[PDB]
Symmetry: D2
Subunit: 285 residues, 4 copies
């Protein structure tokens, strides 16, 4: 049922500078590969088949990464390095397609999603914010848990995670009666942006993963900058909308410390370099 | 009904070299603008709303041309040149979208179209070969004549034009009982590629404009290189397929002489420079 | 003798839109190649060895033009188009180097030439404005003549061409005593911008070809007007006047301004006709026009 | 004294895939900036003024890094992030020029340095391999020491570092008589590639930092092996031996090979810890690991 995902990648990264000065914030290297690969992986391992990049003129290198590189391939055949040729050819299955649409101007997330309207048509769809990485410890990643819940419930889904009470002021936070269990959804009434450290209706931050109906493109055409949460509220007035509580862990690769935490955590766990990396950490003091 | 058009632009141009050495053959300048603009114009003036570029890693400059250029725009505001700012902002209507999908490898036109399968879905669609320019003398361009004929007849359409008998050997040529009139279609049985100057079943060359059903994506998955005409033949075995005979004139911007003929002909007729150009020609001898 | 040339190619090409919305002005097709090829050819046929491109972050396609393209070469081999592959491989003699340096911000032509300071060092150099094409010549080209002149005289050289009396307000024209003969120089004491139709000191227009000494870099670092128009080349040449002779060289040849849309079409026509292979078939296309 | 450095940065980065599939190896994030920033910093802190990038047609992002980004600057202004805008504006001292020349085909390191011939001219120059980071130092850095050494002695200088006896087969190691002290040089008579574990002429590894005279360009034009491995730098330095002293300089500091995936992670760790702002909070992330 849910086969399309919008990845809004058009935004420059003022928060991961100068790393992203001359390359997309999404192509910054997490262990041995760009951060966007962990996000595209996440989508594909949860049944996506059309990755829709809403992109900017400065970000060919993102499209290129999921395309074939003639000169680099046919100097891994001139040399005899077919292990590597495997790492640059088979990034996503033959049946997964990567599409591009440009965001003319940076008029917000809701505007980004709306640029995708031509491509999503009547299909429901996932939204995945590339600067957030999500790490699963099971065999069903939180995007898949969330999609199967959309599929049965037919309620829009918004991935959330609890934050310390003293930082609710840094995040979108959901208006929810009771906090659901790790892995399940509750009904939600709306999102409060950056509520003061006293007056939040939960400790559950909007993490940056959504499943939404085609309907919302209409809603986005008619908001009071176009911001997503406005269209999500407008959705309240017709349908049920649930907040999904993730089982996994997040890293904001936008913040310098969230990216250094992603390198450490994803590195300890790399198939090959994990044990040799664990070693390099031990040798430090 | 017919709202999507596939523009296969992934092919390098060995025939317009060195012009296209470091820029796409499609961005070569015809009077005062890239050749791709005449083709996108053609599609939009005939009711297209999703231009689908099947593209290559070397061709960002094509996507860029239909996107906004921050630094160039906001030094036409620092300067006070709003006539020009009009020529770089309003290339295609707000409601026309430009989509990109990459052709991994150059496995032929039929492969190019098939790369578009994710985006076309069940919709019927137009195919427009960018290195051919088409010039109309009426108020209905041959792509529009051809689309309205698909719409009523439900028969796939293949734009054709008559060639001298001594050059049938340079072109795809249609197998057709009688030649239709300029502006109308006949039934056709197949295309013969480059038949010898004796044994052609008509003098009507395949010009490089099609209207096809979604069906053909299935057909293209199952051809004996994947070449379009094979899938078109396979279509014969189920549906009627008509050859449309254009009222207009062509220029192959692929050949050095067809491009010099496009500059002359399109230049004599430029809103502003037409009369000043006509002048420059007169002054020559 | 003179081995180095600065091509300032960092402009956003506002005069030639939308053609240059998304590719350099310098990569516009004149017949069958980009304009920049005709300017590099001209330099090279005058013994220039080092082409110094003062460039902008979107002008990679200029640099790619004089470099080798793997995927393009290998598709030409696979099609056994060997003469073509030989042409797109030898764009510049093998002894010719193409360098790049960035113009950080677009502060005009003197600031652009100042950006080549480190690559020019103590050498004397030509400047070629790439938006001007200069065609025609019996033997050696106008740039060669003007260089042999800089070599003998050791006077800065500024290429000028005679314009009709009623258009001298469209041009920088030079303060000279008498107009020299075609292919000769004369001392000049200033250039006036868009002089008034009545009273201009000659009919000889500044063309966009210079031979200057390294000295000029030090002068470009000490010309005012930094916030108004930023660094003006004519102001630095004015300062050179104070210690050094400066001469106006008069072309034998004929220029074409591929900055205007209408000068571009003049060039396509004139180069088209003279094209060694298409010229005759292109004349044929013209005749057939009515 | 020594004002010029060639950074050969034209490789396709096969050792560091898929990280470098679609961005230069040289633009890989080490903590919070690309690797190339650390190599340019090092050169500059040793009085290098002209950075000469020998580059490939896909390495624009390297050149864009040391240039100004209009759209990026104007979005930083609109967000009143003025300290950041000041940082991304002054990446290199204002007296430092970054030049580019293309390596037409990938024929190895001597062919790359030969591509800088026209920009080096008669000047003596450093070569810095950008895939090697060199950290640490009490006062002036290893490259400064090695340059002041090239200045006094007028002997080609090759930076070497002591490796464990059982790994000398992973390295080019130098034929020296005695190993010098850290921060000192000694005459060397050859480098042997991956010498055998038993018998190597020292434990001092070639690091990828050189000070060479212009002479070497003429030698690089006359070293054989053109079709085998193409032009080898060690072959040209061997030929320099024939007329000129050549010395091995021993680092005070410590290198990191961001060509391997595992040397990259060493660098991130060691630079992370020493990062002037994140170091302490990054140590904190390590402690919390179990
Ligand atoms: O107009 C918009 C806004 C946001 N986004 C998407 O949302 C995120 C916005 O990325 P930003 O560039 O806005 O975030 P940042 O961390 O650099 O911080 P500031 O610039 O606010 O200081 C990115 O993931 C982007 O792709 C868009 O694509 N377009
Ligand atoms: O695999 C293919 C084949 C063809 N095409 C599309 O069809 C045309 C093929 O363009 P070509 O590059 O094949 O044509 P050319 O005129 O340069 O001649 P040769 O290379 O054959 O010598 C272009 O319009 C291209 O976009 C593709 O997009 N992909």
């Amino acid at each position: 049922m849910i086969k399309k995902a919008v990845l809004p990648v058009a935004g420059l990264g003022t928060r991961f500078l100068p790393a992203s000065k001359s390359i997309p914030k999404e192509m910054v290297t997490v262990v041995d590969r760009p951060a966007i690969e962990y996000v595209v992986r996440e989508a594909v391992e949860a049944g996506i088949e059309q990755i829709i990049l809403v992109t900017h003129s400065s970000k060919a290198s993102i499209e290129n990464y999921f395309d074939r590189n003639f000169e680099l391939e046919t100097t891994l055949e001139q040399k005899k390095k077919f292990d590597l040729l495997a790492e640059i050819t088979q990034i996503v299955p033959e049946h997964v397609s990567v599409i591009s649409v440009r965001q003319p101007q940076p008029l917000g997330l809701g505007h980004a999603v709306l640029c995708a309207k031509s491509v999503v048509g009547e299909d429901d769809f996932a939204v995945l914010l590339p600067d957030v990485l999500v790490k699963d410890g099971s065999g069903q990643n939180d995007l898949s848990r969330m999609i199967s819940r959309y599929n049965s419930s037919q309620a829009a889904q918004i991935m959330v995670e609890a934050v310390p009470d003293h930082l609710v002021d840094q995040y979108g936070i959901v208006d929810v009666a009771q906090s659901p269990n790790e892995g399940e959804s509750i009904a939600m009434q709306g999102i409060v942006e950056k509520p003061p450290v006293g007056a939040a209706p939960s400790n559950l931050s909007v993490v940056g993963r959504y499943v939404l109906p085609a309907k919302i493109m209409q809603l986005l055409e008619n908001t009071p900058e176009i911001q997503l949460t406005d269209a999500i509220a407008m959705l309240q007035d017709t349908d049920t909308v649930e907040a999904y509580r993730m089982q996994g862990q997040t890293f904001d690769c936008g913040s310098k410390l969230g990216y250094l935490k992603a390198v450490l955590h994803y590195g300890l766990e790399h198939p090959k370099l994990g044990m040799e990396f664990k070693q390099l950490i031990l040798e430090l003091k």
